[PDB]
Design a binder for these strands. Sequence first.
RNA 1: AAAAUUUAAAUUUUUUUUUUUUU
Lengths: 244, 293, 447, 267, 215, 204
Amino acid sequence: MSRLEIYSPEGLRLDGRRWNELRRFESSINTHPHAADGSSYMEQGNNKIITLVKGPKEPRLKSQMDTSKALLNVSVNITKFSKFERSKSSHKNERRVLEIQTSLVRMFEKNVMLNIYPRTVIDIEIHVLEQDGGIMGSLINGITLALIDAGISMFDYISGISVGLYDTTPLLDTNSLEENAMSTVTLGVVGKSEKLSLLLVEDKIPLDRLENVLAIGIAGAHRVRDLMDEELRKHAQKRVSNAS
Amino acid sequence: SEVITITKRNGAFQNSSDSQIVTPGELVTDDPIWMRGHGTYFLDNMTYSSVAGTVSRVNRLLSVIPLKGRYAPETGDHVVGRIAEVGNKRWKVDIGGKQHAVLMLGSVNLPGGILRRKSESDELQMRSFLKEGDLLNAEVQSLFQDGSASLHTRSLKYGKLRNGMFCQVPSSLIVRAKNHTHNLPGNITVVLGVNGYIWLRKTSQMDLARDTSSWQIYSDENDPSISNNIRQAICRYANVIKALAFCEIGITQQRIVSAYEASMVYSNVGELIEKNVMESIGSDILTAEKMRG
Amino acid sequence: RRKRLADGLSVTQKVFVRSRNGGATKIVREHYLRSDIPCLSRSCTKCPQIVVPDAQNELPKFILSDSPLELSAPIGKHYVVLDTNVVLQAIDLLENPNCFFDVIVPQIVLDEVRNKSYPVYTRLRTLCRDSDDHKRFIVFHNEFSEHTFVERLPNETINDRNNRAIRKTCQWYSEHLKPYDINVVLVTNDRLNREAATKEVESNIITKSLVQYIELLPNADDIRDSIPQTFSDFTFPEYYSTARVMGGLKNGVLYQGNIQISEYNFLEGSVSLPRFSKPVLIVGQKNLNRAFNGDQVIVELLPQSEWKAPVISDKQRRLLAKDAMIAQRSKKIQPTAKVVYIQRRSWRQYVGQLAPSSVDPQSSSTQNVFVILMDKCLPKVRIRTRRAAELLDKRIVISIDSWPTTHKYPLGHFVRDLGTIESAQAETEALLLEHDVEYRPFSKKVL
Amino acid sequence: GHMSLSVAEKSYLYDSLASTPSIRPDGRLPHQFRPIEIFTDFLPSSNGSSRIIASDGSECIVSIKSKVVDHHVENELLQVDVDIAGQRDDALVVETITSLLNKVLKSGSGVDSSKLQLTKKYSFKIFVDVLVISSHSHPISLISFAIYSALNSTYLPKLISAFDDLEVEELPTFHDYDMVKLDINPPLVFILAVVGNNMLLDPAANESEVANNGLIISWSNGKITSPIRSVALNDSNVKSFKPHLLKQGLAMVEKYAPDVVRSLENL
Amino acid sequence: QDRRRLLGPAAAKPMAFSNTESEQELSLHTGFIENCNGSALVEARSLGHQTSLISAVYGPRSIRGSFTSQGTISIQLKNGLLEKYNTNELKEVSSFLMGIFNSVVNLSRYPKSGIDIFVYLTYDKDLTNSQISSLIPHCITSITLALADAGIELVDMAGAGEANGTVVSFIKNGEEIVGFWKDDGDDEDLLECLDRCKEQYNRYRDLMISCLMNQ
Amino acid sequence: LQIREEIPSKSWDDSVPIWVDTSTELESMLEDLKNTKEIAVDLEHHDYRSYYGIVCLMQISTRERDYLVDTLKLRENLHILNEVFTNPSIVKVFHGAFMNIIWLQRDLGLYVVGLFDTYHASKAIGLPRHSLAYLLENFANFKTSKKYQLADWRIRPLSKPMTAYARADTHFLLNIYDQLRNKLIESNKLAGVLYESRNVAKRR
RNA sequence: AAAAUUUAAAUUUUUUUUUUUUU
């Protein structure tokens, strides 16, 4: 029994949001010029991520080398101050995390034009600072910045969002309070399409909603890569207008 | 009269000519007549960019030049290499670009010249002439199938550095010209690499020879006679590089001279590090750019 | 501070510290205001312009009529906006079918109830959805409302901004209800909140108390006995503080369970504790400490000086608590306990009968009466009331209001007017509810 | 280390800095530091936050989370925990710097744990939690600086009830909005280096490379204090040292220390 | 738990108990480990405090990494039986160890060659009714004797002396200092902190050279 | 060099900036400023409609009365203001007094000796925000005008809240020089404040 | 009317056990 109010009959959420609404969504480009040529910062609500990309460059060992394409390393940093309650132990080989480290690779095996970057290394650095739930799709949207943040060869935008289900009703952009309150699904959505990169369900879901549930998140996901685009573009105008 | 810049800003993560600017995933056109080059991929009509950059339409060739990326190596360029590794008869050496350049064993100026011919005992002395991290003048020959290219030293003018100091910049602000070695009043010399690597040293006689012994081409020696008036004059040219680099300024040899004489306000050379004052001198030259040419 | 979104939409941070298990756990949330907040009424024509469907694709129903009970000018037509306290005092007055048909529930008022009582919070959740043609309850989410949202002022407690926002909540209302001359009546019980509007501080606002509202009804005689509310031989003790009992629970000091107060002995009862085998008696009227039978309480053992044969530190009591289990194995002298806090009242609505001694025949005015309850184990309740000559040969519903320090018998108020003593219909009725039988017809949300 | 430099420089760099009119590669005065940027108060889930920017783009953030604890069952009332990006837990420079600042912030050495004291039975466990994005330096004296601002950017919720839990043993109560700033006098740390007969302040990485040896000096309370360690930067150029040079640097720190402090004691 | 070792059943616990200028002294011995090429044995006993520890040499071992011009030192501090110093407490000392020997060892004599140093904080009494800081100088002495036993090119018998929570390491019969370590103490006691350290250093190095030249 | 207590400026409705409309009231200031051993100073400049530069406005204030200097034709006639402004007995209190002097030095070459800096001198003792939006907030109880300061003062007469804002900014830096004339002697950083004032008025 | 003219793409191994985040 929860002593609180999940979703109002008057249509409202905890901050008063509707079921089809987002948090405040902020990106940034070239946050760290002195660090790497890929440096981008995310605020999606209180989900705050520093995203860092190194490459395309020489390996540390000739063993870790291919004569066909690039490699992709995922290093996730969950701080012990990432949550309200401070976690005791470190996470650096936690089997929960390694799954995502697998996950973003196979999500991003297929945007990178791998053949045109052979014998070189791409390393993607993650710094999870403030954690607000919706944690999975929070990452991917930070990734899509960071590859463009160096301008690496690719096909498309890739969008990510967790959308939750309170009993019948979809919830775009849940939080961790709502995440522990109901069943949620995250979608790794590619560009403008209807094709998926990531699809992950932990919670128990009745089958019959799911087609409708999947039909929800696309309009959210399309508005994601929407808001990424111009925000890059108004940055992109700021270069040449003052470069030239 | 200070030690450190401590200025405070609390409560925030952060403080917060027309051409086509295109994104990845974006259609350019589907006129089939266009040709498809760099930054471009496609499906039979659909012209699709892949980076954050600009549409370049060359006369039937459409291609996308990005804005962000590493240094692109091209042949015949005058850059600076830092010695990464030694191979079989090969060397590895950083450009700053995507990968290392390679450098053949006989690709270098031998002491005594060509009268010193080949020897298999030379690979027993690879570490003799060269070792790690060292800096030099190199001449970009040609490439491989990927885009990785190689170097050589076909002159006396190319060779291992000494007599000064290194600095480095983004590769963008370095402008192209028909010349790259430059000699500056103060009896000193900039060796602007294209790739973003910058070596200063004292003007040699060979430098003086450009405008009117040979066994010292792998030495770690300098001229022993180095005044502080040399040395402190190095640092004044040193910071004004980073001034223009912080101010995003295309390097003109004269602008440096213009940077140097504008820096004659300040004799305290340590004051050449200020975010404002570099920007102020940066603001000086751009205003001074609005007079001459 | 606050920030803006491009939809004209506001975003700010509400942040607090969770005090659970004594921890100091800082909790931060973002907060949104919207500008599509409906006024939810019949007469307004612009809040129905902004109403948008839900995920089930519905635009909801705007039910508060143009026609309230109209009263004596300068009331005229009016709506009612409440206090939590007047709800906390008079929750059953709200459930009168005879009156109060059109009430806005403010969101903060909704929350303090959800802060205070869970099944009372059910009833407002019950009434608002089960509002009908007659009686109409809405919930206005005023702190989701942009135009009624306020902040924490400097040097402020949380109580101040509560009263101020409710005052702010009413302030928008008549402004939106100027075009139809239906007023808004703010009801309170707080004398300091009945002080700042005496000067009419900012708003020319309808600040009346309960009785100051009750004294303006056309039919207020029937309902004023549903208004909630020396008498001394000694003084009863009190119940321990919050940090005292939470400080008592972990150490093994304090115990909770259920108590049974005997009918054949009104002043003696035992509990069944989880640590303890035998039913541990609590002896003494002060030691029962003005709780009722069946309630959830918090008890403390008594010293062996008060143990019965058929200190400052809790370092002593625990070692004495071990001696209780020894004395539990004795069954020759067994320990006594007393209550020190009440985990929960098992109060509800109650039905009884009055005392003929308590009533004056010649009087017509207000007077004290005690109610003889149908529960044999529970004592009489002093009822300050007018119409006792009516209700003496009649069945009644009360509800217990409070227990202050002095009163040997509690303050409560009559709620529902039932019918004649040993009439078959009325004796049918209380036979249902005092046996907990639902009888009410199926409501509008049922059908 | 980080960098690999060339030998011909290494002479000239060891030449120019060991000048008797000593010359930095950027040519500052020998006691100067380098320009930085200092941000805090930006992780609003935390008791305090911090964000500091170097001139070479070295980068760190230190977080402040607190916790209420019994101050009798636990000795260390204040804990430091450090993360460097790019490195294993097992590495050396990690653990030494980690173990260092614990000593620097011992509970009654320069730390005024009475200000941390909640009750006669309880107090505040604090967590100095450190994430370094990048460094090109022996990073330590940078890291103290943000922490100094981090403690100067930390608010704590207010006690409501009383504080004597020996007899009555009350469970302590906090207000839900009222925070008070931690009054504290945090220490500071300075990296030193010895070249020939010269002693530079704030060694940059080039300056850090060529040095014969270097120091770490603990500043607290407006004076010099412990922990103090002689410290290697490289290990190809490690030379010994006259002690008066060691005696020289102390006031050389000290007569320029509070001006850096007052620049940061500036609000 | 740890699947690699025998740690007993988990719910057990170890046993618990409750309450119901001076001289330092040595006994220094070499040549007693046949795995190594340099061994040294140290007894210490001082006033409430008796301490024994072992320094072990492996060198020159090959380096599978790459080319270096010269040698490279590796130092391990490991708990012995009773006293358990903290993990991060250990390696800080290991950091402080390496700095001094990098003003000692002719690494230039030893290209592409490794140095392995194993120090076993084997057993310590502290019967006294910065606890690691009291054991610093004896390490350097214990290392130096083992490094003489492997016969490696060492410039000086360098040693450290202690004065009350302060460790200062010398060369040239004290005429230069090579390693400095300070905890809390007084203020500006440095000049006396020169002295008592120096004379123990003046004591110890003579004890060391007796241990070898008389053998 | 002798500190006093905090003496704020006069009452805000007790004064409007009585501007110098010709050489007459321009001479009214040089007779009034030649008697005070302290003076508040401010200026405004537009870098748009001139190459040599036209200082759009100037504010010069005593302990009670503040001026608004009309410097269109008196740009060439601002040479008489140094009759009190080049004096060692009278500090000229301004916040960042470079372009208040240098634009009067670009066209008029004016004698600069002995001005009291309020902008960067606030940073050394530790008044954190050097802007006139803070000193009018913390020491003068006023509001700033930021979009109007980007706007010029080339024509005359000027706008009255715009002449109330920079004069509040003149009351700002003077009250950022009121307690700065007090607290400088305490924290042992006042000796650098005179040499920094010496570094601004000397080299050109 | 003969005569003839051009290229060149990189090889053989260094690491520390899995809890544990608010019905």
